[PDB]
Amino acid sequence: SKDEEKLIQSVSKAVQYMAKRRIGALIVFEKETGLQDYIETGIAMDSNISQELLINVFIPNTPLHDGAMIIQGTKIAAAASYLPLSDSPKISKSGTRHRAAVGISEVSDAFTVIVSEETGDISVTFDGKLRRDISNEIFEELLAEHWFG
């Protein structure tokens, strides 16, 4: 819908911004698995969403950059939350934010996007499986589909 696409653009434009600037980011989009347990380990925001706020949160050396940001519907549920970590061998040993995204994907049906601190690649995790280095067009397609759809 017309309003849903503004949010996809807001999110998609923020991760592209952080991709080029090499800012690591970890954003969880809640489906039907309740993530209120993982929200409560972070800082509550209950915030509306905007490309500018998404970028501010993940600025390095800031309080909210540490941990995952959790989205519930149209609002920022929390920032700086910690997700559990998977120990599966398929994970390449070459980041923790990648560990956290797979972790939450094994324990929930959430859709998580990761931007790599070192490479700037856009990766996603859902259904316990990591999808690495996807293009922006592919990312918007998947985000639209898992987030609303």
Ligand X SMILES: Nc1ncnc2c1ncn2[C@@H]1O[C@H](COP(=O)(O)CP(=O)(O)OP(=O)(O)O)[C@@H](O)[C@H]1O
Q: Where on the chain is the footprint of a second copy (CB under 8 A)? A: 43-48, 50-53, 55-57, 59, 62-64, 76, 79-80
Work out which of 11, 19, 23, 26 binds ligand X, going by CB under 6 A. Answer: 26
Going from the C-alpha of 125 to that of each of 6, 10, 102, the distances in angstroms are 23, 20, 6
Terminal CA-CA length for the chain: 10
The answer to whether 64 and 77 have CB atoms below 8 angstroms apart is no
The H or E element that residue 2 is part of is helix 2-20
Give the contact letters, 70-99, x = binds to ligand X (CB under 6 A), - = no: ------------xx-x---------xxx--
Nearer to a second copy, 2 or 93 (CB): 2
Q: Does 102 bind ligand X (CB under 6 A)?
A: no
Nearest distance in Å: CB 113, ligand X: 13
